[PDB]
Amino acid sequence: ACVFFCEDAAXIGLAV
Amino acid sequence: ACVFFCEDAAXIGLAV
Amino acid sequence: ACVFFCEDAAXIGLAV
Amino acid sequence: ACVFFCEDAAXIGLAV
Amino acid sequence: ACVFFCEDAAXIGLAV
Amino acid sequence: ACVFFCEDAAXIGLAV
Amino acid sequence: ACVFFCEDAAXIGLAV
Amino acid sequence: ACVFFCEDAAXIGLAV
Amino acid sequence: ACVFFCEDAAXIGLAV
Amino acid sequence: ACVFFCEDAAXIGLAV
Amino acid sequence: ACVFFCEDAAXIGLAV
Amino acid sequence: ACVFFCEDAAXIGLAV
């Protein structure tokens, strides 16, 4: 999978 | 966040 | 390029 | 939450 | 009228 | 996998 | 806006 | 939104 | 202390 | 975090 | 001076 | 605190 850096607030690494 | 369209199988929107 | 659908608030398409 | 397509003009997604 | 999906940046629905 | 809408020209559903 | 990296615990990006 | 790293030659962050 | 990037899920910095 | 003072028109404290 | 990552569009290293 | 990226010359992270 890959890590995306997205604002969820905070910006975190989401693994997809 | 972004919406990804991915297999979970069925295809769904994913909140990224 | 690709079209992504992400929240910026509103949900919009983005050209990548 | 749900996404609705609404006028803001332009048509955009609103997250509610 | 009709909705067109165009990049204005963001891609949004424009009513014509 | 996921499906992204990308120009290949035509815009198509790219499978990845 | 800018991205700041700050501790909130975790270190996260913040949109400013 | 998500932050992508893309070339525009000149590698930049992209607000998606 | 040091900052490590770890799963909490999301990927975040941890201060140790 | 740091406290910033930013407008969102409406000047507020921001938790960064 | 310091370098901040800010959208100018692209995200770039702003020198201040 | 926040991490700033600043000249000390070399560039370093600063704990703010």
Side-chain angles (χ1 to χ4, degrees), chain L:
Chain L
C2 285
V3 180
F4 283 31
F5 302 104
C6 307
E7 286 175 297
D8 176 26
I12 58 136
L14 226 192
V16 185

Side-chain angles (χ1 to χ4, degrees), chain J residues 4-13:
Chain J
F4 286 22
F5 305 107
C6 312
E7 51 183 344
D8 181 54
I12 54 91

Side-chain angles (χ1 to χ4, degrees), chain D residues 9-12, chain E residues 12-15:
Chain D
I12 52 188
Chain E
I12 61 192
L14 301 169

Side-chain angles (χ1 to χ4, degrees), chain G residues 1-5, chain K residues 4-7 14:
Chain G
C2 305
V3 176
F4 285 82
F5 306 97
Chain K
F4 299 101
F5 306 118
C6 309
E7 194 173 31
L14 163 66

